[PDB]
Design an enzyme around this catalytic site. Structure first.
Site, PDB file in Angstrom:
ATOM      1  N   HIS A 234     -16.238  14.100 -13.421  1.00 43.66           N
ATOM      2  CA  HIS A 234     -17.301  13.456 -14.171  1.00 43.66           C
ATOM      3  C   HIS A 234     -17.397  11.961 -13.911  1.00 43.66           C
ATOM      4  O   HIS A 234     -16.386  11.263 -13.843  1.00 43.66           O
ATOM      5  CB  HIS A 234     -17.166  13.725 -15.672  1.00 43.66           C
ATOM      6  CG  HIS A 234     -15.906  13.192 -16.273  1.00 43.66           C
ATOM      7  ND1 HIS A 234     -15.848  11.978 -16.924  1.00 43.66           N
ATOM      8  CD2 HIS A 234     -14.657  13.708 -16.326  1.00 43.66           C
ATOM      9  CE1 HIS A 234     -14.616  11.772 -17.352  1.00 43.66           C
ATOM     10  NE2 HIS A 234     -13.874  12.806 -17.003  1.00 43.66           N
TER      11      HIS A 234
ATOM     12  N   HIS B 181     -16.802  10.537   3.123  1.00 46.48           N
ATOM     13  CA  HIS B 181     -16.361  11.892   3.396  1.00 46.48           C
ATOM     14  C   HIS B 181     -15.166  12.196   2.500  1.00 46.48           C
ATOM     15  O   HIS B 181     -14.104  11.603   2.687  1.00 46.48           O
ATOM     16  CB  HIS B 181     -15.943  12.027   4.862  1.00 46.48           C
ATOM     17  CG  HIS B 181     -15.489  13.405   5.246  1.00 46.48           C
ATOM     18  ND1 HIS B 181     -15.204  13.753   6.545  1.00 46.48           N
ATOM     19  CD2 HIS B 181     -15.272  14.513   4.497  1.00 46.48           C
ATOM     20  CE1 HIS B 181     -14.835  15.026   6.589  1.00 46.48           C
ATOM     21  NE2 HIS B 181     -14.868  15.505   5.362  1.00 46.48           N
TER      22      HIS B 181
HETATM   23  C1  LIG Z   1     -11.339  14.861 -15.997  1.00 46.60           C
HETATM   24  C2  LIG Z   1     -10.173  14.105 -15.448  1.00 46.60           C
HETATM   25  O1  LIG Z   1     -10.305  13.336 -14.509  1.00 46.60           O
HETATM   26  S1  LIG Z   1      -8.657  14.302 -16.128  1.00 46.60           S
HETATM   27  C3  LIG Z   1      -7.897  12.929 -15.338  1.00 46.60           C
HETATM   28  C4  LIG Z   1      -6.434  13.224 -15.082  1.00 46.60           C
HETATM   29  N1  LIG Z   1      -5.814  12.069 -14.465  1.00 46.60           N
HETATM   30  C5  LIG Z   1      -4.505  12.040 -14.287  1.00 46.60           C
HETATM   31  O2  LIG Z   1      -3.877  13.033 -13.982  1.00 46.60           O
HETATM   32  C6  LIG Z   1      -3.796  10.725 -14.492  1.00 46.60           C
HETATM   33  C7  LIG Z   1      -2.309  10.994 -14.298  1.00 46.60           C
HETATM   34  N2  LIG Z   1      -1.491   9.844 -14.589  1.00 46.60           N
HETATM   35  C8  LIG Z   1      -0.849   9.190 -13.623  1.00 46.60           C
HETATM   36  O3  LIG Z   1      -0.609   9.682 -12.529  1.00 46.60           O
HETATM   37  C9  LIG Z   1      -0.449   7.767 -13.930  1.00 46.60           C
HETATM   38  O4  LIG Z   1      -0.305   7.015 -12.711  1.00 46.60           O
HETATM   39  C10 LIG Z   1       0.839   7.650 -14.749  1.00 46.60           C
HETATM   40  C11 LIG Z   1       0.625   8.083 -16.197  1.00 46.60           C
HETATM   41  C12 LIG Z   1       1.941   8.485 -14.105  1.00 46.60           C
HETATM   42  C13 LIG Z   1       1.209   6.173 -14.678  1.00 46.60           C
HETATM   43  O5  LIG Z   1       1.497   5.621 -15.963  1.00 46.60           O
HETATM   44  P1  LIG Z   1       1.516   4.016 -16.107  1.00 46.60           P
HETATM   45  O6  LIG Z   1       2.644   3.653 -17.051  1.00 46.60           O
HETATM   46  O7  LIG Z   1       0.106   3.524 -16.348  1.00 46.60           O
HETATM   47  O8  LIG Z   1       1.954   3.628 -14.607  1.00 46.60           O
HETATM   48  P2  LIG Z   1       1.459   2.313 -13.812  1.00 46.60           P
HETATM   49  O9  LIG Z   1       0.278   2.648 -12.933  1.00 46.60           O
HETATM   50  O10 LIG Z   1       1.373   1.147 -14.767  1.00 46.60           O
HETATM   51  O11 LIG Z   1       2.751   2.153 -12.867  1.00 46.60           O
HETATM   52  C14 LIG Z   1       2.666   1.673 -11.535  1.00 46.60           C
HETATM   53  C15 LIG Z   1       3.972   2.035 -10.846  1.00 46.60           C
HETATM   54  O12 LIG Z   1       4.274   3.417 -11.058  1.00 46.60           O
HETATM   55  C16 LIG Z   1       4.130   4.159  -9.841  1.00 46.60           C
HETATM   56  N3  LIG Z   1       3.238   5.322 -10.106  1.00 46.60           N
HETATM   57  C17 LIG Z   1       2.383   5.396 -11.147  1.00 46.60           C
HETATM   58  N4  LIG Z   1       1.701   6.568 -11.154  1.00 46.60           N
HETATM   59  C18 LIG Z   1       2.123   7.282 -10.093  1.00 46.60           C
HETATM   60  C19 LIG Z   1       1.804   8.618  -9.527  1.00 46.60           C
HETATM   61  N5  LIG Z   1       0.882   9.417 -10.122  1.00 46.60           N
HETATM   62  N6  LIG Z   1       2.470   8.992  -8.407  1.00 46.60           N
HETATM   63  C20 LIG Z   1       3.386   8.190  -7.819  1.00 46.60           C
HETATM   64  N7  LIG Z   1       3.723   6.968  -8.284  1.00 46.60           N
HETATM   65  C21 LIG Z   1       3.138   6.462  -9.402  1.00 46.60           C
HETATM   66  C22 LIG Z   1       3.562   3.199  -8.803  1.00 46.60           C
HETATM   67  O13 LIG Z   1       4.230   3.348  -7.548  1.00 46.60           O
HETATM   68  C23 LIG Z   1       3.867   1.826  -9.352  1.00 46.60           C
HETATM   69  O14 LIG Z   1       5.160   1.427  -8.909  1.00 46.60           O
HETATM   70  P3  LIG Z   1       5.459   0.015  -8.193  1.00 46.60           P
HETATM   71  O15 LIG Z   1       4.235  -0.840  -8.444  1.00 46.60           O
HETATM   72  O16 LIG Z   1       6.684  -0.448  -8.944  1.00 46.60           O
HETATM   73  O17 LIG Z   1       5.708   0.393  -6.750  1.00 46.60           O
HETATM   74  C1  LIG Z   2     -12.162  20.233   7.790  1.00 45.44           C
HETATM   75  C2  LIG Z   2     -11.394  19.079   8.366  1.00 45.44           C
HETATM   76  O1  LIG Z   2     -10.701  19.177   9.376  1.00 45.44           O
HETATM   77  S1  LIG Z   2     -11.523  17.620   7.576  1.00 45.44           S
HETATM   78  C3  LIG Z   2     -10.546  16.614   8.643  1.00 45.44           C
HETATM   79  C4  LIG Z   2     -10.005  15.432   7.852  1.00 45.44           C
HETATM   80  N1  LIG Z   2      -8.560  15.370   7.972  1.00 45.44           N
HETATM   81  C5  LIG Z   2      -7.860  14.395   7.404  1.00 45.44           C
HETATM   82  O2  LIG Z   2      -7.811  14.260   6.187  1.00 45.44           O
HETATM   83  C6  LIG Z   2      -7.137  13.470   8.362  1.00 45.44           C
HETATM   84  C7  LIG Z   2      -6.249  12.462   7.635  1.00 45.44           C
HETATM   85  N2  LIG Z   2      -5.516  11.645   8.578  1.00 45.44           N
HETATM   86  C8  LIG Z   2      -4.287  11.218   8.300  1.00 45.44           C
HETATM   87  O3  LIG Z   2      -3.741  11.454   7.230  1.00 45.44           O
HETATM   88  C9  LIG Z   2      -3.579  10.443   9.386  1.00 45.44           C
HETATM   89  O4  LIG Z   2      -2.181  10.758   9.370  1.00 45.44           O
HETATM   90  C10 LIG Z   2      -3.778   8.922   9.284  1.00 45.44           C
HETATM   91  C11 LIG Z   2      -5.204   8.548   9.666  1.00 45.44           C
HETATM   92  C12 LIG Z   2      -3.464   8.425   7.876  1.00 45.44           C
HETATM   93  C13 LIG Z   2      -2.808   8.270  10.257  1.00 45.44           C
HETATM   94  O5  LIG Z   2      -3.353   8.283  11.579  1.00 45.44           O
HETATM   95  P1  LIG Z   2      -2.428   7.782  12.801  1.00 45.44           P
HETATM   96  O6  LIG Z   2      -2.439   6.271  12.769  1.00 45.44           O
HETATM   97  O7  LIG Z   2      -2.807   8.532  14.058  1.00 45.44           O
HETATM   98  O8  LIG Z   2      -1.008   8.326  12.260  1.00 45.44           O
HETATM   99  P2  LIG Z   2       0.397   8.250  13.044  1.00 45.44           P
HETATM  100  O9  LIG Z   2       0.680   9.613  13.635  1.00 45.44           O
HETATM  101  O10 LIG Z   2       0.426   7.006  13.907  1.00 45.44           O
HETATM  102  O11 LIG Z   2       1.408   8.019  11.809  1.00 45.44           O
HETATM  103  C14 LIG Z   2       2.235   6.857  11.780  1.00 45.44           C
HETATM  104  C15 LIG Z   2       3.139   6.848  10.550  1.00 45.44           C
HETATM  105  O12 LIG Z   2       2.377   6.998   9.345  1.00 45.44           O
HETATM  106  C16 LIG Z   2       2.816   8.167   8.640  1.00 45.44           C
HETATM  107  N3  LIG Z   2       1.653   8.918   8.117  1.00 45.44           N
HETATM  108  C17 LIG Z   2       0.551   9.241   8.824  1.00 45.44           C
HETATM  109  N4  LIG Z   2      -0.336   9.928   8.059  1.00 45.44           N
HETATM  110  C18 LIG Z   2       0.202  10.049   6.828  1.00 45.44           C
HETATM  111  C19 LIG Z   2      -0.210  10.663   5.546  1.00 45.44           C
HETATM  112  N5  LIG Z   2      -1.408  11.305   5.433  1.00 45.44           N
HETATM  113  N6  LIG Z   2       0.648  10.563   4.502  1.00 45.44           N
HETATM  114  C20 LIG Z   2       1.836   9.935   4.609  1.00 45.44           C
HETATM  115  N7  LIG Z   2       2.270   9.356   5.746  1.00 45.44           N
HETATM  116  C21 LIG Z   2       1.512   9.380   6.870  1.00 45.44           C
HETATM  117  C22 LIG Z   2       3.564   9.011   9.665  1.00 45.44           C
HETATM  118  O13 LIG Z   2       4.558   9.849   9.060  1.00 45.44           O
HETATM  119  C23 LIG Z   2       4.162   7.969  10.589  1.00 45.44           C
HETATM  120  O14 LIG Z   2       5.361   7.441  10.026  1.00 45.44           O
HETATM  121  P3  LIG Z   2       6.597   6.880  10.909  1.00 45.44           P
HETATM  122  O15 LIG Z   2       6.156   5.471  11.236  1.00 45.44           O
HETATM  123  O16 LIG Z   2       7.766   6.960   9.953  1.00 45.44           O
HETATM  124  O17 LIG Z   2       6.682   7.793  12.120  1.00 45.44           O
END
Ligand SMILES: CC(=O)SCCNC(=O)CCNC(=O)[C@H](O)C(C)(C)COP(=O)(O)OP(=O)(O)OC[C@H]1O[C@@H](n2cnc3c(N)ncnc32)[C@H](O)[C@@H]1OP(=O)(O)O
Ligand SMILES: CC(=O)SCCNC(=O)CCNC(=O)[C@H](O)C(C)(C)COP(=O)(O)OP(=O)(O)OC[C@H]1O[C@@H](n2cnc3c(N)ncnc32)[C@H](O)[C@@H]1OP(=O)(O)O
Ligand SMILES: CC(=O)SCCNC(=O)CCNC(=O)[C@H](O)C(C)(C)COP(=O)(O)OP(=O)(O)OC[C@H]1O[C@@H](n2cnc3c(N)ncnc32)[C@H](O)[C@@H]1OP(=O)(O)O
Ligand code: NA
Lengths: 206, 205, 206
Positions: free
Chosen positions: B135, B144
């Site tokens: 929403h 995309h």
């Molecule tokens: C209709 C609808 O759309 S329903 C919508 C549903 N939406 C959701 O599911 C929201 C879910 N909630 C979340 O994921 C939130 O991020 C929460 C509740 C986990 C975070 O709570 P908060 O206390 O506000 O966390 P806040 O964003 O202030 O914290 C930031 C830190 O937490 C970490 N963090 C927060 N959320 C996440 C997450 N989902 N995944 C991984 N890391 C997270 C960040 O890495 C950051 O750390 P750093 O800055 O120290 O590296």
């Molecule tokens: C119907 C369809 O087919 S729709 C098609 C759409 N598909 C997608 O969503 C494509 C999304 N693309 C990606 O996620 C790609 O990994 C990108 C664009 C983020 C990275 O592109 P590149 O620069 O070629 O990635 P590359 O292979 O160099 O990755 C470099 C590093 O980033 C990390 N990395 C790359 N992609 C991701 C990802 N999605 N999440 C977490 N880490 C990632 C790799 O693990 C690697 O780490 P290393 O330095 O420890 O080895």
């Protein structure tokens, strides 16, 4: 066509597949084969064990599906059933969407809300589980299992018996070997060699 | 309305779009324009290149631009628009679009994709396979959203940005234009223009 | 059966819920109640505040649904509504797939593309949001919220009022205590104790 379907495996998977087949609304009776469960499961009667397959069920009365989650055992019983001349219909949930240009091997199962897009090839006994999507031009080898909510980008290959976990995903043009296990949530951004077990974001060997 | 549809781009995406259009059951013929391939692709005839944009009458053919690349889909889309072609919003039958959603011309909403109440989509948006836009989201031109990505409520995504397969977003987050979120990207804070992010949570690479 | 429904909560969530009920095409009128929003939302008239629930509204005329995202307040208003004799229909979006063997408690809402598989039990006031899936034999205790695109594997338990975030997932046989908040993307591969808040791949306390 056969008016009866025998679902092998009365576990939790079996319950979903039996309900899948029930949803199609085409069979007159749907039954379970299970080596342990007795009575009826979720309304579906268990008529016997996996031995009825060899000893009593007719290929001219019963369609067979193998609702066993373990890829290797599913292969075992599926190959078995096929060798005894049973039909193993590709079972597609009414709420799945399967492309008309997709090719899907016998015994495969496509769950509620799952999608298989254009030009994808699925070998025998594949499982595309709840809301999993296999995008365009993927290749899923024999007895692969795509777990609930996993999403493969286009041109993803998955090797024989590999298992892709709940909520996992892949980048396009990625290749996963056979006997691989991607954990729940695994983000597969690079090819995965045979036998490996990976997890995390990005997906890396546990 | 026009009985014929031309799909520009006969790649994998173009095959899905062509199948989407066929699933609609409302065209007499669906054809491909492709600068490369010749003949038919997936049963759909290729009848020439983007140059027929010339031979083709906006009074006979609707147009859709099935190109994955946001930049290139943008070019061709404006082109065809300027040539006065209708670029229908193509919504897969197995997709669910809110009746209060607003969707720009040229946009494609794939199978199992969901667009919820009060979401606004500009021109040429792709909401891909089972991707969800909840929403009151705002997707600017030529965004995309890739397969199975999920946007929570009140998520904004900037012009031409690309959100990867199985990525997600916390509600009330904002993504700049020209952003790339990789697959699995968990977007829990705003993203500035041009940035390429990834991981859980999404951080710059 | 009542030919009118009152949707309590006129925020974003309420818009989705009222559209869900509208898609059912069985009510003659769908109205909003909100303590702040006035006039009309999305064509749906906001006819009053929540006060109308205890004051004006008849249980013989209006069904009630509580479209409040917050679990604790949804619980509060729902129990209030039930106590006042009001029916709280389980609202299932036409584009959701809910198993015929699943059990779902009053005031629960199942959004478009959501799936609830066989033998799953849902207590009162659960929300299974857009494209979220709850697989076989899961237990979701009262007023749980499964956010959009979250995928729960088989035999997942979710304790009262817990909140599974957008795109989160669980491996099978995973238990989650009450009052938990797993955030967006949380990859839950182990049990989670009460009141805890986790996120990450894998999900750890933050
Ligand atoms: C209709 C609808 O759309 S329903 C919508 C549903 N939406 C959701 O599911 C929201 C879910 N909630 C979340 O994921 C939130 O991020 C929460 C509740 C986990 C975070 O709570 P908060 O206390 O506000 O966390 P806040 O964003 O202030 O914290 C930031 C830190 O937490 C970490 N963090 C927060 N959320 C996440 C997450 N989902 N995944 C991984 N890391 C997270 C960040 O890495 C950051 O750390 P750093 O800055 O120290 O590296
Ligand atoms: C119907 C369809 O087919 S729709 C098609 C759409 N598909 C997608 O969503 C494509 C999304 N693309 C990606 O996620 C790609 O990994 C990108 C664009 C983020 C990275 O592109 P590149 O620069 O070629 O990635 P590359 O292979 O160099 O990755 C470099 C590093 O980033 C990390 N990395 C790359 N992609 C991701 C990802 N999605 N999440 C977490 N880490 C990632 C790799 O693990 C690697 O780490 P290393 O330095 O420890 O080895
Ligand atoms: C209808 C249906 O439900 S079909 C069901 C399909 N369900 C699935 O997809 C199951 C997926 N399986 C998993 O993710 C599993 O955890 C496996 C197979 C990858 C790992 O198996 P195990 O090694 O037995 O798990 P275990 O609990 O020992 O985990 C070991 C370590 O790996 C980590 N880990 C386990 N699973 C995952 C995962 N999916 N992602 C990231 N990390 C993980 C754990 O946190 C633990 O780390 P630690 O060293 O910090 O403690
Ligand atoms: Na999904």
């Amino acid at each position: 066509g056969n008016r009866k379907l025998a679902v092998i495996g009365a576990g939790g998977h079996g319950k979903v597949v039996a309900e899948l087949a029930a949803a199609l609304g085409t069979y007159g009776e749907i039954v379970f084969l299970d080596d342990r469960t007795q009575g009826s499961v979720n309304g579906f009667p268990v008529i016997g064990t996996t031995l009825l397959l060899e000893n009593s069920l007719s290929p001219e009365q019963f369609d067979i599906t193998v609702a066993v989650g373990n890829n290797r055992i599913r292969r075992q019983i599926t190959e078995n059933a096929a060798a005894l001349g049973f039909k193993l219909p590709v079972l597609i949930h009414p709420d799945a969407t399967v492309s008309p240009s997709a090719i899907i091997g016998q015994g495969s199962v496509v769950m509620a809300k799952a999608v298989v897009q254009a030009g994808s090839v699925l070998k025998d006994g594949v499982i595309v589980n709840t809301a999993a999507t296999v995008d365009h031009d993927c290749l899923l080898d024999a007895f692969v299992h795509i777990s609930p909510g996993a999403h493969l980008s286009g041109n993803t290959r998955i090797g024989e018996e590999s298992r892709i976990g709940t909520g996992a995903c892949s980048r396009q043009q990625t290749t996963v070997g056979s006997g691989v296990t991607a954990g729940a949530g695994a983000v597969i951004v690079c090819d995965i060699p045979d036998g490996m077990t990976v997890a995390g974001n990005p997906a890396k060997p546990l």
